[PDB]
Structure formats: structure tokens, C-alpha cells
Enzyme design. Structure first.
Site, PDB file in Angstrom:
ATOM      1  N   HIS A  82      -7.294  -5.874  -1.485  1.00  0.00           N
ATOM      2  CA  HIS A  82      -6.128  -5.077  -1.102  1.00  0.00           C
ATOM      3  C   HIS A  82      -5.158  -5.867  -0.209  1.00  0.00           C
ATOM      4  CE1 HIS A  82      -3.945  -1.357  -0.852  1.00  0.00           C
ATOM      5  NE2 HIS A  82      -4.092  -1.274   0.445  1.00  0.00           N
ATOM      6  N   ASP A 126      -9.102  -4.400  -6.326  1.00  0.00           N
ATOM      7  CA  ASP A 126      -8.675  -3.749  -5.089  1.00  0.00           C
ATOM      8  C   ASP A 126      -9.805  -2.820  -4.612  1.00  0.00           C
ATOM      9  OD1 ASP A 126      -7.316  -1.998  -3.169  1.00  0.00           O
ATOM     10  OD2 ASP A 126      -5.451  -2.742  -4.020  1.00  0.00           O
ATOM     11  N   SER A 132       0.817  -1.208   0.000  1.00  0.00           N
ATOM     12  CA  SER A 132       0.000   0.000   0.000  1.00  0.00           C
ATOM     13  C   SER A 132       0.868   1.283   0.000  1.00  0.00           C
ATOM     14  CB  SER A 132      -0.933  -0.065   1.223  1.00  0.00           C
ATOM     15  OG  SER A 132      -1.959   0.897   1.129  1.00  0.00           O
TER      16      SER A 132
END
Ligand SMILES: *[C@@H]1O[C@H](CO)[C@@H](O[C@@H]2O[C@H](CO)[C@@H](O)[C@H](O)[C@H]2NC(C)=O)[C@H](O)[C@H]1NC(C)=O
EC number: 3.1.1.3
Length: 317
Positions: free
Chosen positions: A224, A187, A105
């Protein structure tokens, strides 16, 4: 790309050092380190002790990580100071040898920001393996910004932010060290990611850009968190780390590796933690700091985002 000397740090060295930890070793003397940079709303252990800490250990590395307080929610530019300091320390501490950086991330954005604006670390990073990086931010943070419930780094990770604009204008959307980017069209945190093209947030020019669905098909779904912990992600990550080119190789993975479940080599205990990886992050973001404007850019980045607006006003050099 920016050249010359590194910008000065805003934080004292003792504070930056305190944010770095290695498994079973001091950063001043470490064998084959790998630097792990966490995602928004987490510490290093929260992001990786259920996945890449044990997995990198089984590949022969000593995992090290940074944990910029509070939970990566503060200014991304300050989070980057922790990373730059860490690379400097680990390079020397491992006998002046380059080391790989693995991120999740926001960690990928931090790594690329560091490589773009701090020239001294470019020859110290061997390669970058980024899972679900948001180099162009995410459009999904827009409504949170408007509701004034966004932490400093959430503002900066919004598509169109002053920070993401500065990165692009400084030449940061092209790889600086051999880079592999693994991401998913499905995602739920970072979007847009669906085109398998330069338009996606995780894409870097000249990098090895691997959108999961491009290999596994439109019905392959990983979120994610799964972008970091899945067996598919493990196979691509292992390829990138073992590659002689510094990037993952297509010959190393295929249809049989299209497994969305947590990496096979994880223990039952680690698999349970990996499955619920996002839980602590969600809690930290809701409990964390929130403001109604994007943090100002540091002097070294201002010339690359002229005309944008931050807390103090319009950006000028
Ligand atoms: C969070 O980020 C802010 C902004 O980068 C940091 O505040 C700056 O700190 C330096 C050094 O103390 C000062 O010179 C600046 O004037 C500060 N800026 C602002 C806007 O206050 C802050 O230190 C960071 N906090 C943590 C815990 O990392």
C-alpha cells in the site's frame, strides 16, 4: 452525473482555510500548484514529505496539501470540503489556471467524491493522479466495523458502505477529469485489487488504470505504501503529470522501471522515512475515534443510496 450548484459547506471557511498549506507560498499567490490529498491516519506532510513533496518540487510545481483533522479519520464528506475549498483557492491564487491533484489511499476517494458532487471544481482540476485509490472501498475493513473499532472514515471506506454506494449510483465510477490510477494486486490494505479489471477497487471507467503486476509481472510486489513511494510509481506519476492527454502514457514506462524500492531521486533521509510511511498511520488509527455505525450521508447524497443503513437509520431522500 450531478449538475447545478455546489452543496453548501458544513464547516466555516476560516476552518477550511486553516487546513491548507503550500511549501514556501501563501495559497492566494502561488506558482504552478499541485494539490496533495493524504491517506487515512495521516496529515499532508506525514503522507508526502518523504516522497511527492520533494519529487513534485523537482518537476517545477509548488506542492500544497490539506490536512483534514483528525488525521483524515473523520467523515469523508467533510474531508472533501477541505479539498473543494482548496481547489477554489489555488485556482484563483495561481492566476485562474487549472491544477493537478495527486492523492494516496482515501485521498483518491475524496477527490472523486468532490468531482462528482461539487460541479464548480470540474473545470478547475487539470488531472488526477491517484495512488492506491479505494473508490469501491476495501473488504478488509469489514471485521473492524463488526468489532466496533472503526473510525468514521473507515466505515465509509468499507466495500458496500452507504458512501461508496452513493458514489457509484451518482456515476462516480467513471473518470470526470483525465485520471491515472496506480495500484497493486498485493495491496495489504485495499482489496480486492487482483483482477486488473473493472472489479478492482482502484478502477475507473475511461481512466488510465495501471495495476503494477500487469506491467511488471505476478512476482512484482509493492504494498500500500510502496504504491505511492516506489520508483515504478514515480515513473508512472511523472508520465501522468507531463502527459499532453492528462493521463500516463504506456510508451513512457516499461520492464526496466519495475523497481519496488523508494524513488531513486529521494535523498537517503527521505528514503528511510518513505520506507516506514505506514508507521504513523497505524498509530493514528489505533489512537483515533471509533464508532459502531457509518456516518449519515449529507442531504445531497441521500437520493443515491436509498435503502442503505447509516447511524440514524435507513436512507431516504
Ligand atoms: C466530523 O464530521 C462530522 C459529521 O460530518 C461533523 O459534524 C457536523 O458538523 C456540522 C457543522 O458543525 C453540523 O451541522 C452537523 O450537525 C454535525 N454532524 C454531526 C453528526 O455531529 C464534524 O464537524 C466533523 N469534525 C471535524 C473535526 O471535522
Amino acid at each position: 452525473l450531478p449538475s447545478g450548484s455546489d452543496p453548501a459547506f458544513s464547516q466555516p471557511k476560516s476552518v477550511l482555510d486553516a487546513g491548507l498549506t503550500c511549501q514556501g507560498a501563501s495559497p492566494s499567490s502561488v506558482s504552478k500548484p499541485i494539490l496533495l490529498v493524504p491517506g487515512t491516519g495521516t496529515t499532508g506532510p506525514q503522507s508526502f514529505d518523504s516522497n511527492w513533496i520533494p519529487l513534485s518540487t523537482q518537476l517545477g510545481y509548488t506542492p500544497c496539501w490539506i490536512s483534514p483533522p483528525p488525521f483524515m479519520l473523520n467523515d469523508t464528506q467533510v474531508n472533501t470540503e477541505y479539498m473543494v475549498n482548496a481547489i477554489t483557492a489555488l485556482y484563483a491564487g495561481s492566476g485562474n489556471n487549472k491544477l493537478p491533484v495527486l492523492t494516496w489511499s482515501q485521498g483518491g476517494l475524496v477527490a472523486q467524491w468532490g468531482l462528482t458532487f461539487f460541479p464548480s471544481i470540474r473545470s478547475k482540476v487539470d488531472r488526477l493522479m491517484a495512488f492506491a485509490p479505494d473508490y469501491k472501498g476495501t473488504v478488509l475493513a469489514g471485521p473492524l466495523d463488526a468489532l466496533a473499532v472503526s473510525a468514521p472514515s473507515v466505515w465509509q471506506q468499507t466495500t458496500g458502505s452507504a458512501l461508496t454506494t452513493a458514489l457509484r449510483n451518482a456515476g462516480g465510477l467513471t473518470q470526470i477529469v483525465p485520471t491515472t490510477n496506480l495500484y497493486s494486486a498485493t495491496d495489504e490494505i485495499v482489496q480486492p485489487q487482483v483482477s486488473n479489471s473493472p472489479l478492482d477497487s482502484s478502477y475507473l471507467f475511461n481512466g488510465k488504470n495501471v495495476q503494477a503486476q500487469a506491467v511488471c509481472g505476478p512476482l512484482f510486489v509493492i504494498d500500500h505504501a510502496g504504491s505511492l513511494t516506489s520508483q515504478f510509481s514515480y515513473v508512472v506519476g511523472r508520465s501522468a503529470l507531463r502527459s499532453t492527454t492528462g493521463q500516463a502514457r504506456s510508451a513512457d514506462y516499461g520492464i526496466t522501471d519495475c523497481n519496488p524500492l523508494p524513488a531513486n531521486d529521494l535523498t537517503p533521509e527521505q528514503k528511510v522515512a518513505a520506507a516506514a510511511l505506514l508507521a504513523p498511520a497505524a498509530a493514528a488509527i489505533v489512537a483515533g475515534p471509533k464508532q459502531n455505525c457509518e456516518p449519515d450521508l449529507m442531504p445531497y447524497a441521500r437520493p443515491f443510496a436509498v435503502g442503505k443503513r447509516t447511524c440514524s437509520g435507513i436512507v431516504t431522500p
